[PDB]
């Protein structure tokens, strides 16, 4: 239900249409201020005429969209507000709703713009890992698992559409010491005797491994490990296609990908 944007657009469109026709009619009250050379006011006249055409076209385009609204308006939710004045002190509800939404938007914008901090320095539990894994596992198309046969340290893997699974063995909170493979080439279930590491591939995913290592040394936030691993997995998910290759053609090299800024492009160029 995102039709609110199109409806606000239509509001702006009709307001602009009214303003434009009013200004057009007001400008026709007088001729050229001081031409002294020609009657080039016809140019501005044709410009206003085209603006009217633009307005008509926008009105038509918005009439084409915004098909219809659903029946039973308000979905029976404010029936309490629709109720008699006996139970309604009801407007207080909408007031608090608007206040909460405004405060939320304000806090979000403030936090976003506060990213450029001014802190010159920063000075004067085997239960969060499972919780974080459970939270991250709720995400779709990206299945994870963990066995941890080494010890206190964490050992886990992730899966994707293909069989290009990734082996990530890190500490309790922050992700480090990761490696990548492709199409069961690792076989890290019972490799040799157990879930082996072997730190290797067939000389193709080495670039992907280097990129992931660089990313691990880039998304290393001072705190909030949940946000850290979320950024990590979002970065990982950006390779589900490996088909497009902007800033070049998709033939430059073996592959093309380096999206640390949530946007991929031809590698070996940054």
């Amino acid at each position: 239900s995102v039709n609110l944007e199109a409806f606000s657009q239509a509001i702006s469109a009709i307001q602009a249409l009214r303003s434009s026709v009013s200004r057009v009619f007001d400008c026709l009250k007088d001729g050229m201020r001081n031409k002294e050379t020609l009657e080039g006011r016809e140019k501005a006249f044709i410009a206003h005429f085209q603006d009217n055409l633009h307005s008509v076209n926008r009105d038509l385009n918005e009439l084409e969209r915004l098909s219809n609204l659903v029946g039973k308006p308000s979905e029976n939710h404010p029936l309490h507000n629709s109720g008699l004045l006996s139970l309604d002190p009801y407007s207080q509800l909408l007031q608090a709703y608007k206040w909460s939404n405004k405060l939320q938007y304000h806090a979000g914008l403030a936090s976003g713009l506060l990213n450029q901090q001014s802190l010159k320095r920063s000075a004067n539990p085997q239960y969060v890992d499972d919780v974080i894994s459970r939270i991250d596992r709720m995400f779709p198309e990206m299945s994870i698992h963990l066995s941890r046969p080494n010890g206190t340290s964490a050992m886990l893997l992730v899966t994707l559409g293909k069989v290009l699974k990734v082996i990530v063995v890190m500490r309790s909170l922050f992700i480090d010491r990761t490696i990548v493979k492709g199409y069961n080439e690792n076989v890290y279930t019972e490799d040799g005797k157990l879930d082996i590491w072997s730190k290797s591939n067939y000389q193709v995913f080495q670039k992907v491994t280097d990129h992931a290592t660089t990313a691990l040394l880039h998304y290393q936030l001072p705190q909030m490990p949940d946000v850290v691993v979320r950024s990590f997995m979002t970065w990982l998910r950006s390779y589900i296609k490996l088909f497009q290759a902007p800033c070049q053609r998709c033939g430059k090299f073996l592959q093309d990908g380096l999206p640390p800024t949530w946007r991929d492009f031809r590698t070996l160029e940054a």
Binding site: L79, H80, G83, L84, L85, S86
Partner: peptide, 9 residues
């Protein structure tokens, strides 16, 4: 005292 109408229940 309730002289109103249109109850929700």
């Amino acid at each position: 005292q309730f002289c109103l109408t249109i109850p929700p229940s």
